[PDB]
Short mmCIF file of all heavy atoms in Angstrom, two decimals:
data_model
loop_
_atom_site.label_atom_id
_atom_site.label_comp_id
_atom_site.label_asym_id
_atom_site.label_seq_id
_atom_site.Cartn_x
_atom_site.Cartn_y
_atom_site.Cartn_z
N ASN A 15 121.15 108.18 82.07
CA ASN A 15 122.33 108.15 81.24
C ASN A 15 123.54 107.86 82.13
O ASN A 15 124.45 108.69 82.21
CB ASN A 15 122.52 109.47 80.53
CG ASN A 15 121.38 109.80 79.63
OD1 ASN A 15 121.23 109.23 78.55
ND2 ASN A 15 120.57 110.73 80.06
N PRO A 16 123.62 106.66 82.73
CA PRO A 16 124.55 106.29 83.76
C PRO A 16 125.94 106.24 83.21
O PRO A 16 126.14 105.87 82.05
CB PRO A 16 124.09 104.90 84.16
CG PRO A 16 123.41 104.36 82.93
CD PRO A 16 122.77 105.54 82.27
N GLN A 17 126.90 106.54 84.06
CA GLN A 17 128.27 106.47 83.65
C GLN A 17 128.96 105.27 84.23
O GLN A 17 128.58 104.75 85.28
CB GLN A 17 128.99 107.75 84.06
CG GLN A 17 128.32 108.97 83.47
CD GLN A 17 128.38 108.93 81.97
OE1 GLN A 17 129.47 108.85 81.40
NE2 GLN A 17 127.22 108.96 81.32
N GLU A 18 130.00 104.85 83.54
CA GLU A 18 130.85 103.78 84.00
C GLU A 18 132.27 104.13 83.68
O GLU A 18 132.60 104.51 82.56
CB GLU A 18 130.47 102.46 83.36
CG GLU A 18 131.36 101.31 83.75
CD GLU A 18 130.85 100.02 83.26
OE1 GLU A 18 129.69 99.92 82.95
OE2 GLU A 18 131.61 99.11 83.19
N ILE A 19 133.12 103.99 84.68
CA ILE A 19 134.51 104.33 84.52
C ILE A 19 135.38 103.12 84.58
O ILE A 19 135.38 102.37 85.56
CB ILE A 19 134.90 105.34 85.60
CG1 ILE A 19 134.02 106.63 85.41
CG2 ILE A 19 136.40 105.64 85.56
CD1 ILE A 19 134.11 107.64 86.52
N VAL A 20 136.16 102.90 83.55
CA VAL A 20 137.03 101.75 83.53
C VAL A 20 138.26 102.06 84.34
O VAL A 20 138.84 103.13 84.17
CB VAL A 20 137.40 101.38 82.09
CG1 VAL A 20 138.40 100.21 82.07
CG2 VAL A 20 136.12 101.02 81.35
N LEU A 21 138.65 101.16 85.24
CA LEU A 21 139.82 101.42 86.02
C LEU A 21 140.95 100.65 85.40
O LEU A 21 140.92 99.42 85.36
CB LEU A 21 139.63 100.96 87.45
CG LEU A 21 138.40 101.49 88.21
CD1 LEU A 21 138.45 100.90 89.61
CD2 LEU A 21 138.37 103.01 88.22
N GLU A 22 141.92 101.35 84.87
CA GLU A 22 143.00 100.67 84.20
C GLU A 22 144.05 100.29 85.21
O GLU A 22 144.18 100.94 86.23
CB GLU A 22 143.61 101.55 83.13
CG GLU A 22 142.65 102.00 82.04
CD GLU A 22 142.15 100.88 81.17
OE1 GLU A 22 142.68 99.79 81.23
OE2 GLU A 22 141.23 101.11 80.43
N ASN A 23 144.79 99.24 84.93
CA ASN A 23 145.89 98.83 85.79
C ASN A 23 145.47 98.60 87.23
O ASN A 23 146.21 98.94 88.16
CB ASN A 23 147.01 99.86 85.72
CG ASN A 23 147.44 100.14 84.32
OD1 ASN A 23 146.83 99.62 83.37
ND2 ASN A 23 148.48 100.94 84.17
N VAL A 24 144.33 97.95 87.45
CA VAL A 24 143.93 97.62 88.81
C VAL A 24 143.62 96.15 88.86
O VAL A 24 143.32 95.55 87.84
CB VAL A 24 142.67 98.38 89.29
CG1 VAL A 24 142.88 99.87 89.25
CG2 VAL A 24 141.49 98.00 88.46
N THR A 25 143.66 95.57 90.05
CA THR A 25 143.25 94.20 90.27
C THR A 25 142.34 94.22 91.48
O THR A 25 142.67 94.89 92.46
CB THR A 25 144.44 93.24 90.53
OG1 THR A 25 145.34 93.27 89.40
CG2 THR A 25 143.91 91.79 90.72
N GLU A 26 141.24 93.49 91.44
CA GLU A 26 140.35 93.47 92.60
C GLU A 26 139.86 92.06 92.88
O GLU A 26 139.52 91.32 91.96
CB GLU A 26 139.17 94.41 92.37
CG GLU A 26 138.20 94.58 93.55
CD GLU A 26 138.76 95.48 94.63
OE1 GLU A 26 139.14 96.57 94.30
OE2 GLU A 26 138.83 95.09 95.78
N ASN A 27 139.87 91.67 94.15
CA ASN A 27 139.37 90.36 94.54
C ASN A 27 137.89 90.38 94.86
O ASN A 27 137.42 91.08 95.77
CB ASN A 27 140.16 89.82 95.70
CG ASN A 27 141.56 89.53 95.32
OD1 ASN A 27 141.83 88.90 94.30
ND2 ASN A 27 142.48 89.99 96.13
N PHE A 28 137.14 89.61 94.09
CA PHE A 28 135.69 89.53 94.23
C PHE A 28 135.33 88.20 94.86
O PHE A 28 136.03 87.21 94.70
CB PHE A 28 135.01 89.70 92.87
CG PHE A 28 134.99 91.08 92.28
CD1 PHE A 28 136.06 91.60 91.63
CD2 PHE A 28 133.83 91.83 92.31
CE1 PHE A 28 135.99 92.85 91.05
CE2 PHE A 28 133.77 93.08 91.73
CZ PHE A 28 134.84 93.58 91.11
N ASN A 29 134.23 88.18 95.61
CA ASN A 29 133.79 86.95 96.24
C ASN A 29 132.29 86.88 96.31
O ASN A 29 131.69 87.52 97.17
CB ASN A 29 134.39 86.82 97.62
CG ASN A 29 134.07 85.53 98.31
OD1 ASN A 29 132.95 84.96 98.23
ND2 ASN A 29 135.05 85.04 99.01
N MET A 30 131.66 86.10 95.44
CA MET A 30 130.20 86.08 95.41
C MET A 30 129.55 85.39 96.60
O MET A 30 128.35 85.55 96.84
CB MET A 30 129.70 85.43 94.14
CG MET A 30 129.89 83.98 94.09
SD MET A 30 129.34 83.20 92.59
CE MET A 30 127.58 83.16 92.73
N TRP A 31 130.31 84.56 97.32
CA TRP A 31 129.75 83.77 98.39
C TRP A 31 129.77 84.50 99.72
O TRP A 31 128.99 84.19 100.62
CB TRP A 31 130.50 82.45 98.45
CG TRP A 31 130.32 81.76 97.17
CD1 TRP A 31 131.22 81.69 96.20
CD2 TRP A 31 129.16 81.09 96.69
NE1 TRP A 31 130.71 81.05 95.13
CE2 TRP A 31 129.44 80.68 95.41
CE3 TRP A 31 127.92 80.82 97.22
CZ2 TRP A 31 128.53 80.03 94.64
CZ3 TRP A 31 127.00 80.14 96.45
CH2 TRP A 31 127.31 79.76 95.19
N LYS A 32 130.65 85.48 99.85
CA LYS A 32 130.76 86.28 101.07
C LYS A 32 130.28 87.71 100.86
O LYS A 32 130.44 88.57 101.72
CB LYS A 32 132.20 86.27 101.56
CG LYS A 32 132.73 84.87 101.93
CD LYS A 32 132.00 84.30 103.16
CE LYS A 32 132.64 83.00 103.70
NZ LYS A 32 132.35 81.80 102.82
N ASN A 33 129.70 87.96 99.70
CA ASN A 33 129.21 89.26 99.27
C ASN A 33 128.06 89.73 100.15
O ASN A 33 127.08 89.00 100.33
CB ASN A 33 128.77 89.16 97.84
CG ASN A 33 128.59 90.43 97.19
OD1 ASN A 33 128.05 91.41 97.73
ND2 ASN A 33 129.09 90.46 95.99
N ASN A 34 128.14 90.94 100.69
CA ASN A 34 127.07 91.39 101.58
C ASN A 34 125.91 92.05 100.85
O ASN A 34 124.91 92.42 101.47
CB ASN A 34 127.59 92.36 102.60
CG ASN A 34 126.67 92.48 103.77
OD1 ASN A 34 126.30 91.47 104.39
ND2 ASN A 34 126.29 93.69 104.09
N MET A 35 126.02 92.20 99.53
CA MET A 35 124.94 92.82 98.78
C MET A 35 123.80 91.83 98.71
O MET A 35 122.63 92.22 98.61
CB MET A 35 125.38 93.21 97.38
CG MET A 35 126.40 94.28 97.36
SD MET A 35 126.99 94.68 95.71
CE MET A 35 125.72 95.67 94.97
N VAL A 36 124.14 90.55 98.75
CA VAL A 36 123.20 89.47 98.66
C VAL A 36 122.36 89.42 99.91
O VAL A 36 121.14 89.29 99.84
CB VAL A 36 123.94 88.15 98.46
CG1 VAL A 36 122.97 86.97 98.52
CG2 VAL A 36 124.67 88.20 97.13
N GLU A 37 123.00 89.54 101.07
CA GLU A 37 122.26 89.52 102.31
C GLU A 37 121.36 90.72 102.40
O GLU A 37 120.22 90.62 102.88
CB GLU A 37 123.19 89.52 103.50
CG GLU A 37 123.96 88.26 103.70
CD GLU A 37 123.08 87.12 104.01
OE1 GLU A 37 122.13 87.30 104.73
OE2 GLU A 37 123.36 86.04 103.56
N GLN A 38 121.83 91.87 101.92
CA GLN A 38 120.99 93.02 102.02
C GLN A 38 119.80 92.90 101.10
O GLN A 38 118.69 93.25 101.50
CB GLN A 38 121.77 94.29 101.74
CG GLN A 38 120.98 95.54 102.00
CD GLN A 38 121.84 96.76 101.93
OE1 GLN A 38 121.62 97.67 101.14
NE2 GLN A 38 122.87 96.76 102.77
N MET A 39 119.98 92.38 99.88
CA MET A 39 118.85 92.23 98.98
C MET A 39 117.84 91.28 99.56
O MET A 39 116.63 91.53 99.48
CB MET A 39 119.29 91.75 97.61
CG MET A 39 118.16 91.63 96.60
SD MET A 39 118.72 91.19 94.96
CE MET A 39 117.17 91.09 94.09
N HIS A 40 118.31 90.20 100.17
CA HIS A 40 117.42 89.23 100.76
C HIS A 40 116.60 89.88 101.84
O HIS A 40 115.38 89.73 101.88
CB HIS A 40 118.21 88.07 101.34
CG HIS A 40 117.38 87.00 101.94
ND1 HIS A 40 116.70 86.09 101.20
CD2 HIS A 40 117.13 86.70 103.22
CE1 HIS A 40 116.06 85.26 101.99
NE2 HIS A 40 116.30 85.61 103.23
N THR A 41 117.26 90.63 102.72
CA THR A 41 116.56 91.28 103.80
C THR A 41 115.54 92.27 103.29
O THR A 41 114.42 92.31 103.80
CB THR A 41 117.53 91.98 104.75
OG1 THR A 41 118.42 91.02 105.32
CG2 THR A 41 116.75 92.66 105.87
N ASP A 42 115.89 93.07 102.27
CA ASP A 42 114.94 94.04 101.76
C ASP A 42 113.70 93.38 101.22
O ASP A 42 112.60 93.87 101.45
CB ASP A 42 115.52 94.83 100.59
CG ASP A 42 116.53 95.88 100.92
OD1 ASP A 42 116.68 96.27 102.06
OD2 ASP A 42 117.15 96.34 99.98
N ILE A 43 113.86 92.26 100.53
CA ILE A 43 112.70 91.59 99.99
C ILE A 43 111.81 91.04 101.08
O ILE A 43 110.60 91.18 100.99
CB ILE A 43 113.09 90.54 98.96
CG1 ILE A 43 113.66 91.30 97.76
CG2 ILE A 43 111.86 89.70 98.58
CD1 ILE A 43 114.35 90.47 96.75
N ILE A 44 112.38 90.42 102.11
CA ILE A 44 111.51 89.89 103.13
C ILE A 44 110.75 91.03 103.78
O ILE A 44 109.54 90.95 103.98
CB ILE A 44 112.28 89.21 104.28
CG1 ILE A 44 113.12 88.02 103.80
CG2 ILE A 44 111.28 88.75 105.37
CD1 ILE A 44 112.42 86.93 103.17
N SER A 45 111.47 92.12 104.07
CA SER A 45 110.86 93.26 104.72
C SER A 45 109.77 93.86 103.87
O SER A 45 108.69 94.17 104.39
CB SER A 45 111.91 94.30 105.00
OG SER A 45 111.36 95.41 105.64
N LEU A 46 110.01 93.98 102.57
CA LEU A 46 109.04 94.55 101.67
C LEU A 46 107.77 93.74 101.66
O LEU A 46 106.68 94.31 101.76
CB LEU A 46 109.64 94.58 100.27
CG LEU A 46 108.76 95.08 99.14
CD1 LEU A 46 108.35 96.51 99.38
CD2 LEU A 46 109.53 94.93 97.84
N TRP A 47 107.87 92.43 101.58
CA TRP A 47 106.66 91.64 101.57
C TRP A 47 105.91 91.75 102.88
O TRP A 47 104.69 91.90 102.86
CB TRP A 47 106.98 90.20 101.28
CG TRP A 47 107.13 89.94 99.84
CD1 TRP A 47 108.13 90.36 99.03
CD2 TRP A 47 106.28 89.12 99.03
NE1 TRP A 47 107.95 89.87 97.78
CE2 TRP A 47 106.84 89.10 97.76
CE3 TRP A 47 105.13 88.41 99.27
CZ2 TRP A 47 106.28 88.40 96.73
CZ3 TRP A 47 104.56 87.71 98.24
CH2 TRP A 47 105.12 87.71 97.00
N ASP A 48 106.61 91.74 104.01
CA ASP A 48 105.88 91.85 105.26
C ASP A 48 105.19 93.17 105.38
O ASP A 48 104.06 93.24 105.87
CB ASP A 48 106.78 91.70 106.47
CG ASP A 48 107.25 90.33 106.74
OD1 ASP A 48 106.74 89.40 106.18
OD2 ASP A 48 108.13 90.18 107.55
N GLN A 49 105.83 94.25 104.93
CA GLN A 49 105.17 95.52 105.04
C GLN A 49 103.98 95.61 104.11
O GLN A 49 102.92 96.08 104.50
CB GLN A 49 106.11 96.69 104.76
CG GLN A 49 105.41 98.04 104.94
CD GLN A 49 106.32 99.23 104.81
OE1 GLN A 49 107.54 99.14 104.96
NE2 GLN A 49 105.72 100.38 104.51
N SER A 50 104.10 95.09 102.89
CA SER A 50 103.02 95.20 101.93
C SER A 50 101.77 94.48 102.39
O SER A 50 100.66 94.96 102.17
CB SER A 50 103.46 94.66 100.59
OG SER A 50 104.46 95.47 100.04
N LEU A 51 101.94 93.36 103.07
CA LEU A 51 100.82 92.57 103.56
C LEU A 51 100.34 93.03 104.92
O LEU A 51 99.34 92.55 105.45
CB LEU A 51 101.28 91.12 103.70
CG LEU A 51 101.72 90.40 102.42
CD1 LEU A 51 102.29 89.05 102.79
CD2 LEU A 51 100.55 90.21 101.52
N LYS A 52 101.04 93.97 105.54
CA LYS A 52 100.72 94.33 106.90
C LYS A 52 99.27 94.75 107.14
O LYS A 52 98.68 94.27 108.11
CB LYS A 52 101.71 95.38 107.42
CG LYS A 52 101.50 95.81 108.84
CD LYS A 52 102.59 96.79 109.26
CE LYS A 52 102.39 97.28 110.68
NZ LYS A 52 103.46 98.23 111.09
N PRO A 53 98.66 95.65 106.34
CA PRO A 53 97.33 96.17 106.54
C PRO A 53 96.21 95.34 105.95
O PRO A 53 95.07 95.80 105.95
CB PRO A 53 97.41 97.51 105.81
CG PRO A 53 98.29 97.22 104.63
CD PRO A 53 99.31 96.23 105.12
N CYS A 54 96.50 94.18 105.38
CA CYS A 54 95.44 93.46 104.69
C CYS A 54 94.71 92.47 105.59
O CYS A 54 95.10 92.21 106.73
CB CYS A 54 95.98 92.84 103.41
SG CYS A 54 96.29 94.14 102.17
N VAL A 55 93.57 92.00 105.09
CA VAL A 55 92.62 91.16 105.81
C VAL A 55 93.18 89.87 106.35
O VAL A 55 93.86 89.13 105.64
CB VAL A 55 91.47 90.82 104.84
CG1 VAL A 55 90.52 89.82 105.43
CG2 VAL A 55 90.73 92.08 104.48
N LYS A 56 92.88 89.59 107.62
CA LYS A 56 93.34 88.36 108.25
C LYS A 56 92.23 87.34 108.09
O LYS A 56 91.05 87.67 108.20
CB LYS A 56 93.72 88.58 109.71
CG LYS A 56 95.17 89.14 109.91
CD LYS A 56 95.21 90.67 109.72
CE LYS A 56 96.64 91.23 109.54
NZ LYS A 56 96.56 92.64 109.00
#
């Protein structure tokens, strides 16, 4: 039952191209796949 709070009277500069959440998601996925395949048959 997540909450969300509206911030009134604020302005924020967003940048999807310099966003670091993207790099972190990318890294987590690569890491996840390598770990999942780590113990399997060569």
Side-chain angles (χ1 to χ4, degrees):
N15 299 285
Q17 303 298 303
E18 178 172 340
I19 299 170
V20 176
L21 306 181
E22 300 294 348
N23 307 5
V24 300
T25 301
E26 185 76 54
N27 294 312
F28 286 80
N29 184 322
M30 72 181 284
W31 299 103
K32 298 294 189 285
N33 195 317
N34 199 53
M35 294 177 77
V36 174
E37 290 295 322
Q38 187 170 122
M39 182 175 178
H40 181 76
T41 299
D42 286 345
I43 292 168
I44 299 300
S45 180
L46 177 62
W47 278 69
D48 286 346
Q49 183 175 339
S50 293
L51 297 173
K52 181 177 179 180
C54 288
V55 173
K56 278 82 195 165

